[PDB]
Amino acid sequence: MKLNVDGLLVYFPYDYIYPEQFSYMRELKRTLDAKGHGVLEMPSGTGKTVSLLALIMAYQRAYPLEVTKLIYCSRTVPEIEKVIEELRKLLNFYEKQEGEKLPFLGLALSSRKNLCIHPEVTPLRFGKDVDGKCHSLTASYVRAQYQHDTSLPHCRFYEEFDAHGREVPLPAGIYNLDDLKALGRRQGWCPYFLARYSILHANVVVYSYHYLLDPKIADLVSKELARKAVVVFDEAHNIDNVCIDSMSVNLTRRTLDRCQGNLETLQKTVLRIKETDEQRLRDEYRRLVEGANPVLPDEVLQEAVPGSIRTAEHFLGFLRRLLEYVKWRLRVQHVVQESPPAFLSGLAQRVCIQRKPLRFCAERLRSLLHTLEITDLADFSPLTLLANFATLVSTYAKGFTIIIEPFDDRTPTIANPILHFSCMDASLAIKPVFERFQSVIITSGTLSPLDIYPKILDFHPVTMATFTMTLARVCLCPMIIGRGNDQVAISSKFETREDIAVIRNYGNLLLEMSAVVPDGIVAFFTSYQYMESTVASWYEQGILENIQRNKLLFIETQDGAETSVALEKYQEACENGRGAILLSVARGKVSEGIDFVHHYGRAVIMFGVPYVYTQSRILKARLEYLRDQFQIRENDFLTFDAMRHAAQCVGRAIRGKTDYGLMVFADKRFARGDKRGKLPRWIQEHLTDANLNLTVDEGVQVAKYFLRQMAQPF
């Protein structure tokens, strides 16, 4: 299927594709043509993916001198695994269309937790454990011990890869993580290191956003060689929050206690070294005096001489001084305060620790830790985090704040004080991506208005287009319920949120909807407290019994294992005749991780506008900074994030394969003129006055009709 795209005729595998795909491709092409970044939105995942790959591949085949490589990033590995299979399918078509093989290579990267084959780490399942052992297995001392040929458990796959795998680069093809592991097993080469090396001889690379946002991993993959390469985000609607979160760090009482235990372990190691030999380790002292990896970005990090910290004793003393000050500053009993400059100024005043040596805390730590021949970093991790935090806060804080909380999060009060170095802007943190790469494309679904993004992120969008699904039938049906059958407003106002009538209206609505919606249905709540309160209220009433009697019900919690089992049971219940109902919190990890498909979340219910507790210090610092620095109003951004998060959790009902789904919003707020404008265009245009202010009964009636209309073939 040759597509008459604006720039060139593009070969495509499927004989038929929808009109919006042509627009999306020819629109995205503008970013290539204009040699600049842009933003756009498209509901379908697979369609926009395959069309993106086709467009960029054809463009790359047409202009290989202009674009050397394509960098694609997506939400998670399970999605990446499907995308890379779609690329293979596209390449298989292209090879069949061309009739011959071409020098093209594409691969997906992943952490050593998944992308590993060594027998000793294979029984390990925690990422830090696998990484710590892998690092130890690949460590220079283990390599040296291996070169000594003494009895040693070593990574034969690494030695054979360094010897042979490095000597011969893989010629061409597409290698999925499972296929890359099998390849590594067959070749006897480390899949992770082989993939990392293959980046040097590959045209397409796939990894998640944190492989691009965290500078340690991102720098190794975003080298200057990619000075004229294109990077594309496919579902980074929360790129700001992920970026800020990747920059933010949390310190706690137990963290400091672990750091102290680690510090005592370092001291014991220094003693063991001093009693054995320190002169050999002083070989590092020369390069240090001459002048895991730090999270500091390319332009922020420098190989400057570490300063007064010139010995292990100095570093350990300097670390002791800081740890004591941090513990002291953390254990202080007072209201939550923000000291962005004052913490550093306080550190200089209270313990006379200057930012200059402190800037090299992580640099010296890794150097010292390496020379110390430590077993593994897994246990030292809290101390490394403290050292990373220390260098980070001492280097720059323009886009950060220090928050001190007498108690742990998620709890009203606990005798475990915590400190946060909360980040507040994505622009400066993501700046290297836009500065180095020639084009950046922000693609996503459930994407709230685009013009807010150029404010939160520093970019000059070449494209500003919002696409809507084009089909012979309205496969998606958004609807907003604003009134309960009890002739009462169903709005989730903060004071009205706890109203028994609204709670009852949601229960009656869910009872009826769960009875009429086939297979799997899902409902999102604002928070566990309201959810439990709501469930408890429904349990005191007959509502919860009638619901469970009509269909099985499952509820999500903070526990990943319990929610995973419950979700698997929910899905298995949907496979069988029993069917199931899934209740979850919109902000819950399950909502950002789960993908909804036909009969698996066929209908998604949103109870109220998802507004986070506005008294939370994190929100306060973030929101005031956006107003002070980026000039965005408090209610503007707070509503934008609520609209975005609602659409994100609710819009996931449509993912691909042209399967129908229902999206009901139980709040008249969504029907307001501003909220409607903040709603994504595809939802906004399918939404209409007939379904904009439906009564609970009207919602059930329109849903039942829509289900009847969707059951027949196209």
Partner 1 sequence: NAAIIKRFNHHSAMVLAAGLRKIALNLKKSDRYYHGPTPITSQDIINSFQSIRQEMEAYTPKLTQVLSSSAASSTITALSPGGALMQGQMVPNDIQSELKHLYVAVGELLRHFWSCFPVNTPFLEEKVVKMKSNLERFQVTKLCPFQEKIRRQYLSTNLVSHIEEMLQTAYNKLHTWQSRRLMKK
Binding site for ligand SF4 (CB under 6 A): 112, 116-118, 121, 134, 137-138, 155, 157-158, 190, 192-193
CA 657 – CA 597 distance, rounded (Å): 9
Residue 580 touches which of partner 1, ligand SF4, none (CB < 5 to 8 A by kind)? Answer: partner 1
CB 422 within 8 A of CB 621: yes
Q: What's the min distance (Å) between Cβ of 502 and partner 1? A: 20
Residue with smaller CB distance to ligand SF4, 110 or 491: 110
Q: Of 316 and 377, which CB lies nearer to ligand SF4 in the complex structure? A: 377
Residue (176 or 584) nearer to partner 1, CB: 584
| Residue 510 is a binding residue for partner 1 (CB under 8 A) | no
Structure tokens at 73: 């990033």
Query: From the CB of 541, what's the least distance to partner 1, in Å?
Result: 13
91 binds, among ligand SF4, partner 1, none (CB under 5 to 8 A by kind): none
Q: Which is nearer to partner 1, 117 or 566 (CB)?
A: 566
352 is in an annotated binding site: no
Contacts of 660 (CB under 8 A, 6+ apart): 475, 476, 477, 598, 602, 710
* 555 interacts with partner 1 by CB under 8 A: yes
By C-alpha distance, which of 423, 433, 426 is closest to 392? 423
Nearest distance, CB of residue 303 and partner 1, angstroms? 53
Q: Which is nearer to ligand SF4, 59 or 193 (CB)?
A: 193
Does residue 500 touch partner 1 according to CB under 8 A? no
Number of residues that bind partner 1 (CB under 8 A): 19
555 binds, among ligand SF4, partner 1, none (CB under 5 to 8 A by kind): partner 1
Token duo for residue 338: 């923000």
48 annotated binding-site participant: yes
Taking CB under 8 A as the criterion, the residue among 269, 470, 541, 548 binding partner 1 is: 548
Beta carbons within 10 angstroms of residue 334's beta carbon: 8
Closest contact distance (angstroms) between CB of 205 and ligand SF4 is: 18
- Provide the 10 A C-beta neighbour count for residue 307: 17
Q: Name the token pair of 151.
A: 């009895």
- Residue 365 binds what, of ligand SF4, partner 1, none (CB under 5 to 8 Å, by partner type)? none
**Residue 464: beta bridge partners?**
39
Check binding of 578 to partner 1 (CB under 8 A).
yes
Q: Of ligand SF4, partner 1, none, which one does residue 502 interact with (CB within 5 to 8 Å by kind)? A: none
Figure out which of the listed residues 566, 585, 604, 653 binds partner 1, where binding follows CB under 8 A. Answer: 566
Per 3-state DSSP, what percentage of the chain is helix, strand, and coil (rounded to 5)? 55, 15, 35
What does DSSP assign to residue 164?
I
Residue 566 C-beta-side C-alpha neighbours within 13 Å: 19
Q: Does residue 116 have a known ligand-binding role? A: yes
42 labeled part of a ligand binding site? yes
We find the least distance from the C-beta atom of residue 87 to ligand SF4, in angstroms, to be 23
247 is in an annotated binding site: no
Answer yes or no: is 475 a known binding residue: no
Query: Does 155 show up as a binding residue in the annotation?
Result: yes
Q: How many other CB atoms are there within 10 angstroms of residue 258's CB atom?
A: 18
- Name the strands in the sheet holding 400-405, side by side, starting at the edge strand that comes first in the sequence: 249-252, 418-423, 400-405, 337-338
Residue 107 and residue 180: Cα distance in Å, rounded? 8
Among residues 205, 231, 266, 553, the one that binds partner 1 under rule CB under 8 A? 553
**Residue range at the interface with partner 1 (CB under 8 A); choices 234-242, 357-365, 489-497, 532-540:** 532-540
User: Judged by CB, which is closer to ligand SF4: 193, or 318?
Assistant: 193
Greatest Cα-to-Cα distance within the chain, rounded to the nearest angstrom: 83
Which one of ligand SF4, partner 1, none is in contact with 375 (Cβ closer than 5 to 8 A by kind)?
none
Nearer to ligand SF4 by Cβ, of 11 and 158: the residue is 158
Judged by DSSP in three states, 303 sits in coil
Whether residue 259 is annotated as binding a ligand: the answer is no
Cβ closer to partner 1: 32 or 544? 544
Q: Is 190 annotated as a binding residue?
A: yes
What does 622-679 look like in DSSP terms, one character per residue? HHHHHHHTS---HHHHHHHHHHHHHHHHHHTT--STT--EEEEE--GGGGSHHHHHHS
Choose from partner 1, ligand SF4, none: what does 552 bind? Cβ within 5-8 Å by kind.
partner 1
CB of 586 to partner 1, least distance (A): 17
Sheet of 521-525, strands arranged across:
552-555, 580-585, 521-525, 603-606, 661-665, 476-483, 694-695
243 labelled as ligand-binding?
no
Asked if residue 535 binds partner 1 (CB under 8 A), the reply is yes
Nearest Cα residue to 697 out of 494, 490, 477, 473: 490
| 536 part of the interface to partner 1, by CB under 8 A | yes
How many whole angstroms separate alpha carbon 591 and alpha carbon 586? 6
E strands in 391-520: 400-405, 418-423, 439-444, 464-466, 476-483
314 touches partner 1 by CB under 8 A = no
Label residue 465 left, alpha or beta by phi (over 0 means left) and psi (-120 to 50 means alpha).
beta
Q: Is 82 exposed, middle or buried (0-12, 13-18, 19+ CB in 10 A)?
A: middle
3-state secondary structure at position 337: strand
- For partner 1, the binding residue among 554, 600, 637, 670 (CB under 8 A) is 554
Residue 559 as a binder of partner 1 (CB under 8 A): the answer is no
Q: DSSP secondary-structure letter at 327?
A: H
Q: Residue 536: CB partners within 8 Å, gap ≥ 6? A: none
Residues 1-40 that bind partner 1 (CB under 8 A): none
Q: How far is the CB of 144 from ligand SF4 (least distance, A)?
A: 15
Name residue 419's beta-bridge partners: 251, 404
Round to whole Å and give the CA distance between 193 and 163. Answer: 12
Round to whole Å and give the CA distance between 445 and 698. 28
What does each C-alpha distance from 246 to 132, 207, 589 come to in angstroms? 20, 16, 16
If one asks whether residue 569 binds partner 1 (CB under 8 A), the answer comes out as yes
Residue 553, contacted partner among ligand SF4, partner 1, none, CB below 5-8 A by kind? partner 1
Residues at the binding site for [4Fe-4S] cluster are 116, 134, 155, 190
Residues at the binding site are 42-49, 116, 134, 155, 190
* Residue numbers at the binding site for partner 1 (CB under 8 A): 532, 535-536, 539, 544, 548, 552-555, 557, 565-566, 569, 572-573, 576, 578, 580
Residues at the binding site for ATP are 42-49
